[PDB]
Amino acid sequence: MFTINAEVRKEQGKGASRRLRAANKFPAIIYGGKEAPLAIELDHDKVMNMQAKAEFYSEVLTIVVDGKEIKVKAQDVQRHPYKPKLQHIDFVRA
Amino acid sequence: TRNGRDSEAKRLGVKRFGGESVLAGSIIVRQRGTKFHAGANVGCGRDHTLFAKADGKVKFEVKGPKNRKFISIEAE
Amino acid sequence: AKTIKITQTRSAIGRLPKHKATLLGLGLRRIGHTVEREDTPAIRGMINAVSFMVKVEE
Amino acid sequence: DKKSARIRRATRARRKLQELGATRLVVHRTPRHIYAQVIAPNGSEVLVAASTVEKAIAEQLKYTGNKDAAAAVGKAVAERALEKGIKDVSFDRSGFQYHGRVQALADAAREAGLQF
């Protein structure tokens, strides 16, 4: 039911990761199944409002990226240490 | 309580690293216990000092079922 | 290899001894010394160490 | 345990011959039979093997394992060793005492002319 707009990452490492967090973004990943893992960048303010409800961690998540709807599930979330922000969210294809 | 003593620091550690060609009789690693174990062409001294018994290069291996470290010498 | 050019930008006074030895291996002596070098990864690794203070022209 | 106490007893004598690079003669003792193998110093291959479960030896024996059988198979390994010529093998007692069939298999091979 939850639809999240996403884009594929063009770089990797903590260098590109800190540049996204200074530009109202945060990286993520989508893994699981027989498919290869895909590097995913996400808008920070959009996910932060959605994660406040308990249905964001229980129900099946839908992600529209590159003209493709992949049904996933939230597996693990990394949060900022002291600010109420997000760092990295794990996704399992289910 | 009445502290302030320290001994002379004994010059331990690895003296001949891996890949180095050593002579027969040279000291590879000075040590107290068997941090390193004797292997191929390597003799163990009285104070557990591992020395060379043949001319060749130093080769470090981790063998045995107890996952212990060894020193071997391959022929150059 | 093909020829590139390395020109020193800043001085070598406040540098580390590794950065001073890097400029001696690159043959740089003063600011504005333009000299030709080859584009091997050994020379390119010397450029990567002092990239804050050299100018390179491919 | 019965078997594992035999293995840890021999282990000091096993790895000592590994440090010298010599060819060892191990023995396996059984209430039924007895074994003896000449092993290369790498330890992953043998060169001379002759036992009492082979029918060539058991025909001349009243019972498959005793002091008379260890004298027979001790010679039998030693005669096959002289045909190969390993010539100063080492003796591995393999966790047993040097009193009975282990001694009988060794002294029989000493009589044939092997250097141990």
């Binding site: 994660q51 308990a54 961690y57 939230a74 693990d76 979330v77 949060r79 900022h80 240490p81 002291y82 109420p84 | 502290n3 302030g4 | - | -």
Partner: protein
């Protein structure tokens, strides 16, 4: 007063307060008090801030302390020259990093949690903020 009952050695070096915290999420209750700034919490500060909230959250619910000092600080007294060995142990401190959950509380309303954690933030020498338990 929160202090170790027995240590292997009496004294300890000064150390530093570098790095990030590891006490990120509340894992005992539903409400927490997370440190924002950087510094040290002495033994008196942890004891006083526990007394500061407990007055207003009367005897129901449950309060956890997620930290423990485990670090002594020695002092050299007045009119004493430098040297003569290290001084005597006076008080215990805790190395606190930005992001450490310090004080937790469960079984209280959310409006009551905002009051008591505000009353305990003044006793702490570093800035704090209010957090709430997020699942997973």
């Amino acid at each position: 007063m929160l202090q170790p009952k027995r240590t292997k050695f009496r004294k300890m070096h000064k150390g530093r307060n570098r790095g990030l915290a590891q006490g990120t999420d509340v894992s005992f209750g539903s409400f927490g008090l997370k440190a924002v700034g950087r510094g040290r919490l002495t033994a008196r500060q942890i004891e006083a801030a526990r007394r500061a909230m407990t007055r207003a959250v009367k005897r129901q619910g449950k309060i956890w302390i997620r930290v423990f000092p485990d670090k002594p600080i020695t002092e050299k007294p007045l009119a004493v020259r430098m040297g003569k060995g290290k001084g005597n142990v006076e008080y215990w401190v805790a190395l606190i990093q930005p992001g450490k959950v310090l004080y937790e509380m469960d079984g209280v309303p959310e409006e009551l949690a905002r009051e008591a954690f505000k009353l305990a933030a003044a006793k702490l020498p570093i800035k704090t903020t209010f957090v709430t338990k997020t699942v997973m």
